[PDB]
Design a protein around this ligand. Structure first.
Ligand code: CL
Ligand code: CL
Length: 154
């Protein structure tokens, strides 16, 4: 009844462990100035997220901040996706430099900057932008690349 509650957490942690594992396979964008903001932003979410999941392990069902720590785990997942999407576009932009569509979708919907970033977002607002605006643009970018890979390979 309450044990089902804590395991519910250990799992979310483990899901995050798997997620970070896959993020690790995706190349990092590096130190380019274009990603300097996302880089430091991700660095913070990483430091903050790792702490939260370490706690969610040594955390017991009756914690006052049980809910707070949980919500944070949920936001982390979406922060992981963003870092992931951006690592992918960085890679794509280098493979298909100049291509307008990629640069445009990125700048309009994914690029993180002071003001327009998920640094100020949490909960439903956060998942909304990620599952919608960000994922949509990622999909369109991928259609571009597909065509590009097809055109490249005349
Ligand atoms: Cl954004
Ligand atoms: Cl979008």
């Amino acid at each position: 009844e309450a044990m089902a509650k804590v395991e519910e957490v250990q799992k979310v942690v483990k899901e995050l462990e798997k997620e970070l594992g896959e993020l690790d396979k995706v190349p990092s964008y590096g130190d380019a100035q274009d990603y300097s903001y996302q880089k430091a932003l991700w660095e913070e979410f990483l430091r903050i997220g790792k702490d939260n999941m370490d706690y969610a392990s040594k955390m017991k069902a009756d914690d006052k901040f049980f809910h707070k720590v949980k919500g944070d785990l949920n936001d982390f997942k979406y922060q992981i996706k963003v870092e992931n999407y951006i690592r992918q576009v960085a890679e794509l932009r280098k493979k298909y430099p100049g291509d307008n569509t990629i640069e445009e979708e990125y700048n309009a919907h994914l690029k993180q900057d002071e003001g327009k970033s998920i640094a100020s977002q949490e909960g439903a607002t956060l998942r909304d932008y990620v599952d919608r605006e960000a994922s949509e643009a990622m999909g369109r970018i991928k259609q571009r690349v597909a065509e590009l890979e097809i055109l490249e390979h005349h």
